[PDB]
């Protein structure tokens, strides 16, 4: 196939600050339904802490890729297994607070 | 004149350098529509004088996994070349694609 995925950007707390429109096919929501909300809000309660600790660590990893697997609640009311790969970017011309760039794919847990 | 954040945009490439996705923001910066870029090689866009360096930068990316391009020209939709600098990050799964954070050095606005 050609596995489906979408890019998002987040501030360090988890809030969606940018979402690529490929999110419709992957998790069923429109970008405007994600923008402004925290990724942790769509996350299964057993995986929320793992996701919060992952956000915290990705900033310590010096722009390196961090990967996390978690259950995301689609707009079709299903728990989807999502592998989110993320890394921080900070423009080295600036001292602006870094932010977090993600790619999000529905994967199989097996 | 545009600030740094307003001059930064994302693109995603398959391993052969083809665009698979581009931020809408490229349009106000370099004139292209993301739609017209899909399927085209990044390489079709580089100034010939920066070509050599972009090939090495790529090879370095494939072995390290993250690399900063350093300064290069990209041909803009409506004539002339714009200066960029790019950070490249390979995404491997279980290499799946390359994430590029692109920053336009040239003065814009
Ligand atoms: N818009 C736009 C762009 C076309 C240009 O693409 C690259 C710029 C620098 C690079 S690079 O190789 O210098 C870098 F990824 F390390 F930055 C690369 C690309 C495409 C790529 F395959 F991801 C990669 O070859 C950025």
């Amino acid at each position: 196939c050609q596995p489906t995925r979408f890019i998002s950007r987040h501030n360090i707390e988890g809030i969606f600050t940018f979402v690529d429109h490929r999110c419709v096919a992957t998790v069923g929501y429109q970008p405007q339904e994600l923008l402004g909300k925290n990724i942790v809000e769509f996350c299964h309660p057993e995986d929320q802490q793992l996701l919060r600790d992952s956000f915290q660590q990705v900033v310590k990893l010096k722009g390196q890729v961090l990967s996390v697997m978690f259950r995301f609640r689609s707009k079709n009311q299903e728990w989807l297994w999502m592998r989110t790969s993320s890394f921080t970017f900070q423009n080295p011309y600036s001292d602006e607070i870094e932010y977090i760039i993600c790619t999000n794919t529905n994967v199989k847990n097996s | 004149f545009k600030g740094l954040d307003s001059k930064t945009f994302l693109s995603e490439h398959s391993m052969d350098m083809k665009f698979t996705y581009c931020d809408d923001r490229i349009t106000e910066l370099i004139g292209y529509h993301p739609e017209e870029l899909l399927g085209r090689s990044a390489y079709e866009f580089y100034h010939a004088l920066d070509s050599e360096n972009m090939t090495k930068s790529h090879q370095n990316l494939c072995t390290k996994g993250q690399v900063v391009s350093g300064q290069y020209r990209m041909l803009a939709k409506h004539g002339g070349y714009v200066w960029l600098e790019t950070q490249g990050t390979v995404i491997y799964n279980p290499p799946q694609c390359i994430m590029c954070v692109n920053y336009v050095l040239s003065e814009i606005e």
Side-chain angles (χ1 to χ4, degrees):
Chain A
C1 196
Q2 274 75 61
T4 40
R5 58 158 188 265
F6 67 93
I7 296 155
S8 60
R9 157 181 39 288
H10 301 264
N11 62 26
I12 62 160
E13 163 170 303
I15 305 307
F16 284 96
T17 55
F18 173 82
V19 202
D20 144 28
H21 173 100
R22 283 176 304 176
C23 74
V24 191
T26 322
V27 296
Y29 289 103
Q30 301 289 322
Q32 55 275 39
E33 296 170 290
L34 309 183
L35 282 181
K37 297 158 165 192
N38 197 304
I39 197 172
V40 175
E41 294 183 295
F42 291 89
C43 181
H44 187 290
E46 276 160 39
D47 298 330
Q48 298 177 355
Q49 197 51 54
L50 185 52
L51 195 49
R52 295 196 175 284
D53 306 321
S54 296
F55 275 77
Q56 278 153 238
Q57 217 194 35
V58 69
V59 323
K60 291 164 188 196
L61 293 174
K62 280 189 209 316
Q64 255 172 104
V65 182
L66 174 59
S67 176
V68 60
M69 251 189 88
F70 70 95
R71 295 162 274 196
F72 181 108
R73 193 63 175 172
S74 69
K75 192 196 174 34
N76 292 315
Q77 297 270 227
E78 284 154 335
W79 288 117
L80 301 187
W81 280 105
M82 296 301 297
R83 179 173 302 118
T84 282
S85 300
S86 70
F87 60 94
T88 58
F89 170 78
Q90 195 277 140
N91 189 323
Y93 283 103
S94 87
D95 184 41
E96 282 316 294
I97 188 54
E98 69 269 325
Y99 57 65
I100 288 164
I101 295 297
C102 299
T103 302
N104 303 281
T105 299
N106 189 188
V107 302
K108 285 205 224 190
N109 176 24
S110 71
Chain B
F1 290 132
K2 282 179 192 273
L4 310 190
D5 178 278
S6 304
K7 295 202 285 153
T8 301
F9 66 99
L10 313 196
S11 61
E12 175 198 81
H13 302 263
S14 46
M15 296 316 293
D16 55 20
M17 300 183 81
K18 302 182 188 184
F19 282 89
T20 54
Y21 160 89
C22 188
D23 276 2
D24 277 335
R25 173 114 85 202
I26 194 175
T27 308
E28 44 206 2
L29 293 179
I30 314 179
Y32 303 98
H33 295 276
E35 157 278 307
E36 73 189 293
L37 298 177
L38 298 194
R40 297 189 62 181
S41 179
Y43 199 103
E44 299 168 35
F45 297 89
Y46 299 147
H47 190 293
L49 293 184
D50 298 319
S51 281
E52 282 212 24
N53 313 302
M54 305 305 289
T55 270
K56 290 198 211 54
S57 274
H58 189 83
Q59 281 155 348
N60 266 4
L61 187 68
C62 282
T63 76
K64 305 191 235 324
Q66 194 174 86
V67 143
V68 174
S69 76
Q71 311 181 323
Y72 70 95
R73 283 152 289 188
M74 199 185 156
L75 178 65
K77 168 101 179 196
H78 294 302
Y81 283 90
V82 113
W83 286 93
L84 286 127
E85 212 180 288
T86 290
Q87 174 196 297
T89 298
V90 193
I91 303 190
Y92 300 94
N93 249 62
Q96 304 314 300
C97 67
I98 306 166
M99 285 293 328
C100 291
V101 181
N102 308 302
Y103 171 60
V104 172
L105 288 156
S106 307
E107 52 170 51
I108 305 286
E109 267 228 319

